[PDB]
Write an enzyme that holds these catalytic residues in place. Structure first.
Site, PDB file in Angstrom:
ATOM      1  N   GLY E  14      19.453  13.459  31.818  1.00  0.00           N
ATOM      2  CA  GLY E  14      20.864  13.610  32.127  1.00  0.00           C
ATOM      3  C   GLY E  14      21.756  13.508  30.906  1.00  0.00           C
ATOM      4  N   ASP E 152       9.357  27.545  32.747  1.00  0.00           N
ATOM      5  CA  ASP E 152       8.165  28.386  32.742  1.00  0.00           C
ATOM      6  C   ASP E 152       8.378  29.637  31.902  1.00  0.00           C
ATOM      7  OD1 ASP E 152       7.276  26.489  34.563  1.00  0.00           O
ATOM      8  OD2 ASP E 152       7.776  27.733  36.297  1.00  0.00           O
ATOM      9  N   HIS E 178       6.415  26.742  40.957  1.00  0.00           N
ATOM     10  CA  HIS E 178       6.844  25.942  39.818  1.00  0.00           C
ATOM     11  C   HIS E 178       5.862  24.827  39.476  1.00  0.00           C
ATOM     12  CE1 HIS E 178       9.765  24.722  36.861  1.00  0.00           C
ATOM     13  NE2 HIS E 178       9.909  23.521  37.387  1.00  0.00           N
TER      14      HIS E 178
END
Lengths: 303, 316, 58, 316, 316, 316
Positions: E14, E152, E178
């Site tokens: 974050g 990815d 994913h």
């Protein structure tokens, strides 16, 4: 049946306005006399310019297809300050018949005051090519194609000044102000006793930044005859850029007041033409810190 | 989105300015082009570029010039900024004034709220003319009329940078007017050490005679057109970004002083925002030489304002 | 005498064939018949179509 | 330091190209300008822009052209890239072929290790002439001669992005030649679903005919000039960045096929590096319609090459 | 203007994501930060950066978590984008499911028209849970829920560029899921020649196994946090630009297939616009080997979706 | 090519600094990373970003620190810039001074011609220690040692822009030192009108004390980490671009005065390029309050320098 003649007079107005949308002014006092032309031609000389136009205008109600009526109306209405309202009359004078050289000159002038170069050159050319003795970079054509036929018309008939007037108009519209003045000077040498070219001499000096020369020409013009409000307007313009605003405003107002001297002063529709002159009052009178006066400048009733 | 119109787009300055504007405008905006000759060709040429999100539009004027051209009355619908760059390629003033009055009259009658940027020379006289034309129809806004004078700032920055090299400043303040004696560069307000007075006044003199230098090199056959296009595009992008809310820049422009200076129009620093000028800034401290120069410049600037606001043509 | 002129003027003004036109035309017509300013008032009044005397005169 | 020289800088195309190049060149680089008429004026105009770290040079030739101009042998020392953009507005071919070879002969006798980018209009026939000229003096390097063809790709990208919306693509492959029937866009090699074949071949035809569209819009008074400036500036920037070591881009250009195609010159993909062309890439898979188009394009490209080589061999 | 809220801003990902987002956001935006511990210090640290035009806000929750937090209710008014990046550093799913459900329920009750971007790790299972949570309230919009999977593509592009140097490509399409076996890169759809099939298999395995490479180097002490911050920031900037009307980009994301596929959720190409998703595109042609991998990937992701939706209903 | 080495890359500042530096470094450059714990993990995940043309290297030291570590000896070969950010989070002074001495001694023994940028606190005392170490080796260069003090300028700009809105300036001069009473912001040298002296007093005091309110916000648990990372990255980019020849910036840094001032080390404006510092500039005009502040600042800075050199002298 007392109404019978009023009815037809009313019809004649709109019946001819449709074919020519010249805004014939309601509240015209000559429209019920018997010989308006005979007194209109006299009013043009002895009295105010602005109230002979109504007589020539009243002729066109009794008599359409009379060339003299539109010739005179279109000429005098531009000796006053109403150019836009004169163009459409000279066009009808041409439509009657194209051969009149006295109409093409008034078109040649009246279009330069609105920068219609194409119309100006068209009419200026046909003016010459109507007479039976002139037979056959601003713009790489369409301009020198005209000036070269004027330079073919001065090795002969050397000194009629209405030709030098055409040269003056041609050089004015192409911003050759420093040699238009001598053309009008020669014209004025050859006939001295008419205001109509003194005005055009002064107007070229004013644009050439010689405003100290122009005032003498305007005081010749406004001495050959009074009431020629064009030159009064030009005097106001000359004073404005000489920075004498307190005097320019008082020339403007005696222009504006004289333009409308008749009893029952005005009707409708023509007033759009005068609304071009008040803007020069406002433009000067909005120097010199004049508050609370530009609002009336926006409507009427002077000062 | 914004709609930006270039009035006079086929001239020497106009098409380079349009080329620069095409590749800088934000995604999703319209570019409008107008001229009395050559507009269709320039519009066809520019629309083959592979810029995504940009739509190019044009209108062709009347071949023999006509006042209040209907073509320009329809292209002017929905426009947000007007760049007025048309002009002839006191003889120059007498014609450029008449061109500007009619262009602004036609444009301002259909989209009154747009911003007007004046590039036609001389700006000292053609900005008051536009102000009076807008006052006549009753839609004048003092916060949305701007005169472009960035070119002498570019010249001043360029001339000072290659004397102190290596020492680079991004800009130099310039105030006063926009022609010869009326422009005053304030070199005392930039950071770093400064040359001696004899050199510094030679630099100051060159800035205000730089227009003649280019025309002399071209043998009198033309003027500078690439520099003017660069300056005009750079100034226009500031206005576009400030209107959208993506910036709030400080610039120097020839504007109405709104009673904060005794001269009705002057070049001054301002802050731009979402609805025009948001803040007018003072000139700030200056030295005695610069004070004398400004005293000299203001007297001529007032004489130019008077010439501009009293313009009228004499009826033959 | 004059009364003939005044009555003719009234019956002229009170007709739809004529009402819609501007008053400034009708004054100029009526002047030609020997109706002066004073009598034009007499006519507008008796028809109920009052106009100020000075506005006729001016 | 990198030095790039624009030959023909005072022309209609050359001026916008020089203006765009000044804005994007890297810090600490030189820009040299040459022309037979009008060079000093454009040099003076561009020197006033406040771009820091850039040097501007210029030279002027004799008013009546002369072979082996002694001013161009002086401006040509130390140059890294030549942008050959001179050319008068089959007589057109006959005059431009004589201009190009003389310009190349003058520049290559001074700095033979530079790159040559050909922007003169009939590229298909003028790129072999430069190769023969370089061979005559004996300094030909097949990895340092390039013909500029970016404008076809610009148009092909623009038209397809107009067809599909909102679905943007950055580039489109185009092979073959640089003239009318020799242009072949490969739409089958871009991502995303395509429109049906009937409109796709209309787009293909428009890409080939777009040159004549602008000339009609100008009523025969000129051609496209801003688009060519854009393409030339973009390509020159690619060459500069690859040469300095700051990139290795992939481009489409009219180059020499050093044995991997039957046609001696063709437009094909390549990778640029520190010494010019680093790698030559194959065309790749194509559909049957595209194969038929390419097979017809090659036959006329070979005749153009033969015409150019015959002219050069006769002249030298 | 836009208001972007980062939920869980004091974690490892974050803080870096907020730092990158502060430097990139457009002029005139707002940045909001929320966490249960440490938010005030992060807000104080970021508020000293000299970035003009951006405002920073913060709120702090109870040290022992409390459902439907009153502070988060007050910070959520007026937000346009929510970035859900909170998560504990199959308990790894059973713990984060409750966090995601509570956060989405609290945020959607205050501003139901915002976009939701899910960055919490079990993307294949957490994206359906958010959908069912929004549906339970009656405010579900299928065009405004996106799962982030750009890492990815970053990995695939990096690995391919290293093998074909100097030939460079800007992106690689990746579809499927994913996690591990559900990731399928499509190398047959990029330009240029490729290496042998024996090398492509190793490159494809690297992309699927790359997540465990970082954990091994850290000796089990952590995972990748700079790469994920990079991916999240780059995706959020696309979303912001699309919402503001400054672009229409094409992206790959884990989205709801609106009946266009047999699988309820899948990673597939889309085009973004002012209202969210504007168009969904087909996957396109693929090789036999890629088809046989897509079959297995779809088989696995169906079970993942079923697991995600299993207790999003009939609990809490 | 430039090779930049970050020393202490696994810490709180180092991770963010490396992430930011990876995204901005020019094409064809190398990044070297080192630490005593955690270097492999940070180097693994930064190597998965898809930025082309950048090479990432790493080394790890023995967990119990060893003076003159061979791993750092091998990594330091061929480096151009060293960023020393290895501080431990007068015990602090005693701990950090020895670390700085050891690292500089190890690095300068294999590449003496590099530039050293010192980020570990306290700068006022650690920069003289590095100078003393380099003089002991025999390779001291006054033009290639810099102390980074750019965070105070960031804070000063932020606070003054918050005060005057909308009126933005890009930077504020700051002189003196880099700790509390030694920080002197010169607001009199920025454009535009200023607020009352009573509010400038409070703004200056806020600038001098800003470092403590972040510590108080974190409840004594930590300090600022993001703003220091950003300042370090920006200064490093300035140095790199100047060294490659692509700029000549003007910056404020804690450097050797070289007889320009009565204090041996001071924060002052400089212009650097291609060899480190190019010119050191005078401070310029200041008001009476600023003169009073600077007197006390210099009085304290002399004591800090004395203590640093006293520590350095005792080690052979």
């Amino acid at each position: 049946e007392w109404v019978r003649e009023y009815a037809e007079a009313q019809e004649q107005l709109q019946r001819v306005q449709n074919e020519t949308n010249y805004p014939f002014e309601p509240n015209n006092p000559y429209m019920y006399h018997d010989k308006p032309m005979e007194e209109g031609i006299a009013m043009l000389q002895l009295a105010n310019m602005a109230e002979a136009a109504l007589a020539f205008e009243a002729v066109c109600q009794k008599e359409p297809e009379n060339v003299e009526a539109w010739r005179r109306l279109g000429t005098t209405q531009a000796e006053n300050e109403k150019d836009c309202l004169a163009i459409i009359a000279l066009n009808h004078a041409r439509m009657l018949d194209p051969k009149d050289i006295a109409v093409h000159a008034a078109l040649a002038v009246s279009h330069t005051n609105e920068h219609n170069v194409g119309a100006a050159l068209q009419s200026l050319r046909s003016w010459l090519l109507s007479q039976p003795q002139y037979e056959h970079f601003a713009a790489p054509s369409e301009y020198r194609d005209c000036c070269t036929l004027l330079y073919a018309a001065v090795e002969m008939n050397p000194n009629d000044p209405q030709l030098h007037a055409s040269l003056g108009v041609l050089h004015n519209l192409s911003h050759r102000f420093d040699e238009a003045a001598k053309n009008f000077r020669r014209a004025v040498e050859l006939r001295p006793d008419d205001a109509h070219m003194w005005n055009k001499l002064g107007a070229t000096l004013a644009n050439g930044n010689r405003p100290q020369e122009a005032l003498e020409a305007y005081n010749r013009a406004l001495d050959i005859n009074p009431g020629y409000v064009r030159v009064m307007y030009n005097m106001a313009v000359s004073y404005s850029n000489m920075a004498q605003y307190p005097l320019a405003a008082k020339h403007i107002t005696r222009a504006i007041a004289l333009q409308a001297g008749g009893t029952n002063p005005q009707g409708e529709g023509s007033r759009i033409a005068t609304r071009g002159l008040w803007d020069l009052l406002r433009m000067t009178l909005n120097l010199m810190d004049r508050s609370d006066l530009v609002e009336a400048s926006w409507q009427q009733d002077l000062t | 989105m914004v709609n930006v119109a270039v009035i006079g787009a086929a001239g020497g300055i106009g098409q380079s300015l349009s080329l620069l504007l095409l590749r800088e405008l934000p995604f999703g905006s319209t570019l409008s082009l107008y001229d009395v000759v050559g507009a269709p060709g320039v519009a066809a040429d520019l629309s083959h570029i592979d810029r995504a999100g940009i739509t190019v539009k044009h209108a062709a004027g009347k071949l023999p010039p006509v006042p209040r051209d209907p073509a320009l009355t329809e292209l002017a619908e929905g426009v947000d900024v007007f760049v007025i760059v048309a002009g002839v390629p006191d003889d120059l003033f007498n014609v450029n004034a008449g061109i500007v009055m009619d262009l602004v009259l036609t444009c301002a009658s259909v989209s009154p709220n747009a911003c007007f940027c004046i590039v036609t020379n001389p700006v000292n006289s053609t900005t008051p003319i536009a102000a009076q034309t807008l006052r006549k129809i009753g839609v004048y806004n003092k916060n949305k009329l701007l005169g472009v004078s960035l070119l002498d700032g570019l010249r001043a920055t360029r001339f000072i940078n290659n004397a102190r090299h290596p020492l680079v400043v991004p800009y130099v303040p310039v105030v006063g007017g926009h022609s010869d004696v009326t422009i005053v560069p304030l070199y005392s307000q930039i950071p770093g050490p400064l040359p001696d007075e004899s050199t510094l006044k030679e630099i100051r003199k060159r800035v205000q005679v730089a227009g003649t230098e280019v025309v002399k090199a071209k043998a009198g056959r033309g003027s500078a057109t690439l520099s003017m296009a660069e300056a005009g595009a750079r100034f226009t992008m500031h206005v576009v970004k400030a209107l959208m809310g993506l910036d709030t820049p400080m610039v120097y422009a020839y504007v109405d002083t709104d009673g904060e200076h005794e001269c009705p129009f002057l070049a001054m620093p301002v802050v731009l925002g979402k609805n025009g000028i948001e803040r007018r800034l003072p000139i700030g401290p200056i030295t005695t030489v610069e004070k004398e120069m400004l005293e000299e410049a203001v007297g001529v600037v007032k004489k130019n304002i008077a010439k501009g606001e009293t313009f009228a043509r004499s009826k033959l | 005498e004059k009364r003939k002129r005044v009555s003719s003027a009234v019956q002229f003004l009170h007709d739809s064939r004529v009402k819609i036109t501007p008053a400034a035309n009708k004054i100029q017509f009526l002047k030609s018949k020997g109706l002066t300013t004073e009598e034009v008032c007499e006519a507008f009044e008796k028809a109920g179509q009052t106009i100020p005397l000075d506005e006729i005169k001016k």
